[PDB]
Amino acid sequence: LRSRVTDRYWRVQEVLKHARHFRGRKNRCYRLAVRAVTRAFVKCTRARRLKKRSLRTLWINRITAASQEHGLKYPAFIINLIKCQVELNRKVLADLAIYEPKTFKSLAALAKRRREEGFAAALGDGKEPDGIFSRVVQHR
Amino acid sequence: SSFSKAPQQWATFARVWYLLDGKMQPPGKLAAMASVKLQGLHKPVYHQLSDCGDHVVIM
Amino acid sequence: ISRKWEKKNKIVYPPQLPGEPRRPAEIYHCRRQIKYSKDKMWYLAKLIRGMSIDQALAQLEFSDKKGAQIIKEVLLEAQDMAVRDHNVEFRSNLYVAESTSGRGQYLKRIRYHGRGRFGIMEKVFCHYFVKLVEGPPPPREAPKTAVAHAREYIQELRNRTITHAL
RNA sequence: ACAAACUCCUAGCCCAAUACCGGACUAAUCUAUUGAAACAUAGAAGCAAUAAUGUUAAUAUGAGUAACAAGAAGCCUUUCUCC
RNA sequence: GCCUAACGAGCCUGGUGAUAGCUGGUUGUCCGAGAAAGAAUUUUAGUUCAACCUUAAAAAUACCCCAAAAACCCUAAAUUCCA
RNA sequence: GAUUACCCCUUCUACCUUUUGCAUAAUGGUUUAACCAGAAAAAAUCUAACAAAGAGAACUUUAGCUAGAUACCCCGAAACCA
Ligand SMILES: [Mg+2]
Ligand SMILES: [Mg+2]
Ligand SMILES: [Mg+2]
Ligand SMILES: [Mg+2]
Ligand SMILES: [Mg+2]
Ligand SMILES: [Mg+2]
Ligand SMILES: [Mg+2]
Ligand SMILES: [Mg+2]
Ligand SMILES: [Mg+2]
Ligand SMILES: [Mg+2]
Ligand SMILES: [Mg+2]
Ligand SMILES: [Mg+2]
Ligand SMILES: [Mg+2]
Ligand SMILES: [Mg+2]
Ligand SMILES: [Mg+2]
Ligand SMILES: [Mg+2]
Ligand SMILES: [Mg+2]
Ligand SMILES: [Mg+2]
Ligand SMILES: [Mg+2]
Ligand SMILES: [Mg+2]
Ligand SMILES: [Mg+2]
Ligand SMILES: [Mg+2]
Ligand SMILES: [Mg+2]
Ligand SMILES: [Mg+2]
Ligand SMILES: [Mg+2]
Ligand SMILES: [Mg+2]
Ligand SMILES: [Mg+2]
Ligand SMILES: [Mg+2]
Ligand SMILES: [Mg+2]
Numbered sequence A: 001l002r003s004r005v006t007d008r009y010w011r012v013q014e015v016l017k018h019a020r021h022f023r024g025r026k027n028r029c030y031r032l033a034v035r036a037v038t039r040a041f042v043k044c045t046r047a048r049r050l051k052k053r054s055l056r057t058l059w060i061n062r063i064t065a066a067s068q069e070h071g072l073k074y075p076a077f078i079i080n081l082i083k084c085q086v087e088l089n090r091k092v093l094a095d096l097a098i099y100e101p102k103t104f105k106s107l108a109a110l111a112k113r114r115r116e117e118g119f120a121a122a123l124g125d126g127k128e129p130d131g132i133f134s135r136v137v138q139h140r
Numbered sequence B: 001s002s003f004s005k006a007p008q009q010w011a012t013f014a015r016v017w018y019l020l021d022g023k024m025q026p027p028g029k030l031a032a033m034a035s036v037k038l039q040g041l042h043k044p045v046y047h048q049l050s051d052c053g054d055h056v057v058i059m
Numbered sequence C: 001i002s003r004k005w006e007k008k009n010k011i012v013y014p015p016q017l018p019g020e021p022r023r024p025a026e027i028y029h030c031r032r033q034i035k036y037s038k039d040k041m042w043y044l045a046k047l048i049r050g051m052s053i054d055q056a057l058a059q060l061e062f063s064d065k066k067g068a069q070i071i072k073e074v075l076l077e078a079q080d081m082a083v084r085d086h087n088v089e090f091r092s093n094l095y096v097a098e099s100t101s102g103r104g105q106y107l108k109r110i111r112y113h114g115r116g117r118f119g120i121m122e123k124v125f126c127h128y129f130v131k132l133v134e135g136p137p138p139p140r141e142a143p144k145t146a147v148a149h150a151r152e153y154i155q156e157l158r159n160r161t162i163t164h165a166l
Numbered sequence D: 001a002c003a004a005a006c007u008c009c010u011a012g013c014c015c016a017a018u019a020c021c022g023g024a025c026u027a028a029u030c031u032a033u034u035g036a037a038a039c040a041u042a043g044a045a046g047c048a049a050u051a052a053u054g055u056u057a058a059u060a061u062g063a064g065u066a067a068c069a070a071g072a073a074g075c076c077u078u079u080c081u082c083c
Numbered sequence E: 001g002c003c004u005a006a007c008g009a010g011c012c013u014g015g016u017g018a019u020a021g022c023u024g025g026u027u028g029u030c031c032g033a034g035a036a037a038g039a040a041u042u043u044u045a046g047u048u049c050a051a052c053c054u055u056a057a058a059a060a061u062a063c064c065c066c067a068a069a070a071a072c073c074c075u076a077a078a079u080u081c082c083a
Numbered sequence F: 001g002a003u004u005a006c007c008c009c010u011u012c013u014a015c016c017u018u019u020u021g022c023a024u025a026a027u028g029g030u031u032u033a034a035c036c037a038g039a040a041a042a043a044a045u046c047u048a049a050c051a052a053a054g055a056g057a058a059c060u061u062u063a064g065c066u067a068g069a070u071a072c073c074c075c076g077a078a079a080c081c082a
Helices: A008-016 A030-069 A072-081 A090-099 A100-126 B005-013 B025-037 C005-009 C040-045 C053-062 C068-084 C146-157
Strands: B018-020 B054-057 C026-034 C094-103 C109-111 C118-123 C128-136
Touching: A008 A030, A008 C005, A030 A072, A030 A090, A030 A100, A072 A100, B018 B025, B025 B054, C005 C026, C026 C068, C040 C068, C040 C094, C040 C128, C053 C068, C053 C094, C068 C094, C068 C128
Parallel strands: B018 B054
Antiparallel strands: C026 C128, C094 C128, C109 C118
16 A cells, blocks of 8 residues: 655645745745744744843833933932832833823932932931931831 | 824934034043934934934034 | 747737727737747847837847847737737837747757766757737836935935834 | 843743653545545554755756857859968 | 776676675654663674663652761871661 | 834854764755655563453463554675675
8 A cells, every 4th residue: 555645735835834035045945945944933932032131122221311311320210210119110111201201301300309318318327307208108 | 292293203303413522522431422422322212223313513 | 838828819808888098909929949049039038128119120130149030020920910910000009018038848969078978968949928019118217316316215214103112 | 220041920731952761642545434525433554854975857057158160252163272 | 917998806697685883864743751881892983781761560768867886107178877 | 023114223153964072164965846764572561351260272371361452774885606
């Protein structure tokens, strides 16, 4: 009972589906296609991992620029926003930086205020005064 | 805040000429900020693939 | 073998509704198994494209290549069928729409070398295809002006978005 | 401050790998019954090629590249020019 | 040297799927677990045993481990062995 | 990866074989199609029959017997003999 593979056409089609937009001979010849397609998928999955650090880099830059406009550097801005107990994404923060410049300058004013409060608190060398923005709320 | 679409587009991506006076400055510290402004890295709309970046005139 | 091109003359259309644009005559013609090579034939085919049939005949006539006499006869045949078998008023009204060469079937032979080595020598044949259309030759495209470029560039600066930003 | 496969967070089908060794499924044939257009339970096998300076057929590239040939004029076989 | 364009021993057909501890190849998907050299050997390009390991099974203790304990002249980091 | 946008940006040392280690400047392949390489049932495990017995003859039996199912490639010398 001799058997041959009749459906070889669709087997090839399934790997050429992905190969159509490649340059040169990879979009035709089944060898070249197979290899370039495996390459393509591997870089696909690595890109999934990268694109999270890329987007986060982008965000940090935009936050840095927005912060620079108001004369405050990136680390200062972020730390002080945190020490005020305001937890905001860098995604949400960069979006505020572009599409709501007013609110964002409000934030930068807040952070700057909180920081000067910090310098004054630590240089003052006494334990008593709580700057109005230095109090810490425990939730109920 | 309410602009037509084409003018909003134009206003956002406008190229802005900067002047920077040089006399008695370390050329490195000069090139630091000159480069930042050149590249568009002061604009919160910045992206690598956008053409955005501004002229810089050093005198 | 595949014969298709020849059959493109066998299409019969539905009659004309009143006052529409008159669809200009298309004539197809080919010549199969010419003794010329495909690659040389290509240059002749490339030369006469878009020309009015009279200019094409003029060019071909004085050209040196042995393909010239061939493509010439083919254009004359095409013209004769254009006026006779189809109906075309004003036989100089034709221009060349599409001109092209395909490879025909090839002959195989031995080519002796030296020290008793042989190469495999392929006798070359090719087909010549031409499509003629009745009407004055289409206008040749003018090189982009500065007023064009500046328009592209602005249209691009103005197509930007703030990316990843919403 | 910025920085990982580490660790949180929101959902899950819930944690790497060469030699060797376990499992679960399935492509394409044929044969039993079904199935009727692509079939589903079994039983069977010449049972699945991106790699053997693989075999045959056909196509490219090198490449229109290397290399090949017909002494002159006329009235068309008649003179010339040479070996 | 030569014995029909390969002669330290012709060519052909058999023996012949000669025999290669030596190269070179060996085709679907997805999951479990996963290895580094102690012996002998015409042995060191290889095999066959042990040890580790994989797949099933039966069980009871396994690593860690405080005193206590293991040499006689001098002798460090540390081992062995156990609740 | 993406982008309004093909590029332009940013991130990535062809593939097999072979090795302690190969982007290697180690081997292999122009490309397409068709062909082109894992076979055995002693012992074992798994599923059933009947059981002090079991097998459609000869055998084996201190839970055994009988049946099924699970297994071990392809191409290459120089040679030697008629
Ligand atoms: Mg058959
Ligand atoms: Mg993750
Ligand atoms: Mg050829
Ligand atoms: Mg991080
Ligand atoms: Mg694993
Ligand atoms: Mg097979
Ligand atoms: Mg194939
Ligand atoms: Mg070679
Ligand atoms: Mg091959
Ligand atoms: Mg060629
Ligand atoms: Mg050349
Ligand atoms: Mg030459
Ligand atoms: Mg001559
Ligand atoms: Mg001889
Ligand atoms: Mg062998
Ligand atoms: Mg011995
Ligand atoms: Mg050996
Ligand atoms: Mg113990
Ligand atoms: Mg490396
Ligand atoms: Mg190889
Ligand atoms: Mg080595
Ligand atoms: Mg090297
Ligand atoms: Mg080499
Ligand atoms: Mg080698
Ligand atoms: Mg090679
Ligand atoms: Mg047995
Ligand atoms: Mg039993
Ligand atoms: Mg002997
Ligand atoms: Mg011998």
